[PDB]
């Protein structure tokens, strides 16, 4: 495994977009670009959304940082147990 510094970064912005997660976590999978990123999300707010509208979400989260979500992979939830 390794980090980019836009790995810290992407995690930053996603802590305030989703204050309400259960769970959180990012990983560089890309040690020679820093193109493609894992994602790990679960929050009470996604309960009024699809898949492709939680991912959604996330999306924006770093797109105003980072834009090439074509590289990451997003894994999101609600918690509703």
Known sequence: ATQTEGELRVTQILKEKFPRATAIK???????CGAMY???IESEEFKEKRTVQQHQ?????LKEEIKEMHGLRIFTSVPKR
């Not at 979400?57 to 989260?61: E, I, K, L, T, Y």
């Open 38 to 40: 894992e994602i790990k």
């Open 57 to 61: 979400m996330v999306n924006q989260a």
């Open 26 to 32: 990012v990983t560089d999978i890309s040690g020679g």
